[PDB]
Structures are given as structure tokens and as C-alpha cells.
From Swiss-Prot:
GO BP terms in the entry: apoptotic process; apoptotic process involved in development; cellular response to mechanical stimulus; chromatin remodeling; DNA damage checkpoint signaling; DNA damage response; DNA repair; DNA replication
Subunit structure: Interacts (phosphorylated by ATR) with RAD51. Interacts with and phosphorylates CLSPN, an adapter protein that regulates the ATR-dependent phosphorylation of CHEK1. Interacts with BRCA1. Interacts with and phosphorylates CDC25A, CDC25B and CDC25C. Interacts with FBXO6, which regulates CHEK1. Interacts with PPM1D, which regulates CHEK1 through dephosphorylation. Interacts with TIMELESS; DNA damage-dependent. Interacts with FEM1B; activates CHEK1 in response to stress. Interacts with TLK1. Interacts with XPO1 and YWHAZ. Interacts with CDK5RAP3; antagonizes CHEK1.
Impact after mutating residue 37 to R: Abolishes kinase activity
UniProt keyword annotations, A-Z: ATP-binding, Cell cycle, Chromosome, Cytoplasm, Cytoskeleton, Disease variant, DNA damage, DNA repair, Isopeptide bond, Kinase, Nucleotide-binding, Nucleus, Phosphoprotein, Serine/threonine-protein kinase, Transferase, Ubl conjugation
Residues annotated for ATP binding in this entry: 14-22, 37
Protein name: Serine/threonine-protein kinase Chk1
MF terms in GO: ATP binding; histone H3T11 kinase activity; protein domain specific binding; protein kinase activity; protein serine kinase activity; protein serine/threonine kinase activity
Cross-link (Glycyl lysine isopeptide (Lys-Gly) (interchain with G-Cter in ubiquitin)): 131
Source organism of this protein record: Homo sapiens (Human)
GO cellular component, one term: nucleoplasm
Impact upon substituting residue 131 to R: Strong reduction of chromatin-associated CHK1 ubiquitination
Protein origin, superkingdom: Eukaryota
Length: 268
């Protein structure tokens, strides 16, 4: 018998798209603040097995570089996923178009990203859509991974399953998802962390998509690093990007090896 907090007022929009939106919410009492993803389960096909799968995965999660799940309310047919509020905003907005950000800052964000991904992969979960818009800064300006709407489980019982499904955001997607039927999930997330890195350091994405029909991508395979955005990236992290942006997912650097990378371990 103690009523007053858990009734949230939708204070303002944060980022709306085609599924509802996200609202900063404040408890009418505790004054607690949270992010609320609004989503109407309209019909039954692109939801009954979409938003539900997202809640399922959010419950498994618990790491400091992963946005927190505080429950959900499915009263009628509208879904409210109470999620951790990160007043720092999206990593996207700290990237100065065509400039990026101070290398030290990028290195710190990359470490937190790697810690988050290391965490996820360890519990057999793959995000499948890592990008600056999905990476948020909390009140301390520390990076946390969010939106697991496209995420899934690939390992468990100590057994790894292979993927084949083609999802994600083009510019940030790995080539195997465009030329292979099946593929390991971990290598894809790493590839995407590599694109985020490029963006933080260069303030621009390398290509529109990873295909030989894309010049920018072809130039990369040909080592034309005198071309943007590479020319804007110091040789140390560029050397790491060379290890991450490898077409053959079997020859791609693993996370345990990125942590052994010089630039990665460099005191900046
Ligand atoms: N799935 C999922 C998910 N879980 C937790 C959160 N967002 C999610 O959604 C991620 C895509 C959301 C778009 C980014 O949202 C946001 C946008 C802005 N800036 C808005 C702003 C404030 C002041 N001036 C300019 C812009 C802020 Cl300050 C926070 C969030 N997001 C959150 O606090 N939490």
C-alpha cells in the first residue's frame, strides 16, 4: 500500500520513426526519469514476432555499456518499453560532419563500445545493427548500446548457430550479408564497430555499401588510403581499421585481437 510513482508523464520526444517513437518520461512523484519506446502492435505480422523478441532479449541483458531495461506495459495494444534514459544523447550528434571528434574521445568511446559488444557476444547475443544513432551517451558521457529490435541469440548451451538473414543499415553492414547465404554473427558486429570508428575519426562514412559495385569500397580493397576518409585518419587507428574492414570474415580480426592492438592500448 504505497501509491504515487510509476505513472509517467511524456515530457518530450527524443527520436521518432516508423514503429512509434521514444519519449523522455518523468514519474509524477519519484521524479525518476526514463526513456519510453512507444509502439502500436498494429495488425499481426511485423510485430507479434518483433517487439516481443526485443523485450525477450532486453531481459537477458545487464552490463554497464548496455542501455537498461526497466520493464514494459502492454495494457491494450500499445507497447511501452521502459528503457534507460541517457541524457547525453546519441553518439551521432558528437560527430562533427566531415571532421569527427578528438581522437582521444573516439578511443574512449571505442573501448566502451568494445566492452559492450564483448559483453553481448559472451552471452551469445548479436546486435546486428550497430551505428552512431544506436549508441547513446549517458549522464557521464559514457557510451551504452541500445535498440535490440533486430538483435538475436546465436550461441548458448555452448553451441553456435549460423545466421543468413539480411538485416541492418546498409553503410554499416558487412559484405558477407550481401554475398553469402550463411555466416558467423560475431564477425558482422565487429565489422560495424569498424565503420562507427571510421565515422568518429573521420566524420564521414567510407561507402554507401560494401560491394565491388561501389567505387569507394573498391578503392578500399585496393588500399587507396590517400583517399578520404582514410587520409583523415592517423596511421595507428587506420592500421586497426585495416584489420577490421576485411571482406573475408574468416580473416577478420576478432575482438580478443583488437584489444591487443597498439592504437587500442595507446595512452592518449
Ligand atoms: N531501443 C531503444 C532506446 N533505449 C533507450 C533510449 N533510446 C532508445 O532509442 C534509440 C533511437 C532513439 C533516438 C535516440 O534517442 C535519444 C535522443 C536524445 N536527444 C534528443 C535531443 C535533446 C536535446 N537537444 C537535441 C536533441 C536523448 Cl538526450 C536521449 C535518447 N535516448 C535515450 O535516452 N534512451
Amino acid at each position: 500500500a504505497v501509491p504515487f510513482v510509476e505513472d509517467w508523464d511524456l515530457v518530450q520526444t527524443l527520436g521518432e520513426g516508423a514503429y512509434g517513437e521514444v519519449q523522455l518520461a518523468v514519474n509524477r512523484v519519484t521524479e525518476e526519469a526514463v526513456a519510453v519506446k512507444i509502439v502500436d502492435m498494429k495488425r499481426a505480422v511485423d510485430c507479434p514476432e518483433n517487439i516481443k523478441k526485443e523485450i525477450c532479449i532486453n531481459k537477458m541483458l545487464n552490463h554497464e555499456n548496455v542501455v537498461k531495461f526497466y520493464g514494459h506495459r502492454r495494457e491494450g495494444n500499445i507497447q511501452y518499453l521502459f528503457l534507460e534514459y541517457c541524457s547525453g544523447g546519441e553518439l551521432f550528434d558528437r560527430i562533427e560532419p566531415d571532421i569527427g571528434m578528438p581522437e582521444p574521445d573516439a578511443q574512449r568511446f571505442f573501448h566502451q563500445l568494445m566492452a559492450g559488444v564483448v559483453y553481448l557476444h559472451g552471452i551469445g547475443i548479436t546486435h546486428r545493427d550497430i551505428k552512431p544513432e544506436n549508441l547513446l551517451l549517458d549522464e557521464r558521457d559514457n557510451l551504452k548500446i541500445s535498440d535490440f529490435g533486430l538483435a538475436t541469440v546465436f550461441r548458448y548451451n555452448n553451441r553456435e548457430r549460423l545466421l543468413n538473414k539480411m538485416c541492418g543499415t546498409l553503410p554499416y553492414v558487412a559484405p558477407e550479408l550481401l554475398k553469402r547465404r550463411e555466416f558467423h554473427a560475431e564477425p558482422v558486429d565487429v565489422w560495424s564497430c569498424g565503420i562507427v570508428l571510421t565515422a568518429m575519426l573521420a566524420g564521414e562514412l567510407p561507402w554507401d555499401q560494401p560491394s565491388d559495385s561501389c567505387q569507394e569500397y573498391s578503392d578500399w580493397k585496393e588500399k587507396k588510403t590517400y583517399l578520404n576518409p582514410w587520409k583523415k585518419i592517423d596511421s595507428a587507428p587506420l592500421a586497426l581499421l585495416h584489420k577490421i574492414l576485411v571482406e573475408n570474415p574468416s580473416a577478420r580480426i576478432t575482438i580478443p585481437d583488437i584489444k591487443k592492438d597498439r592504437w587500442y592500448n595507446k595512452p592518449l
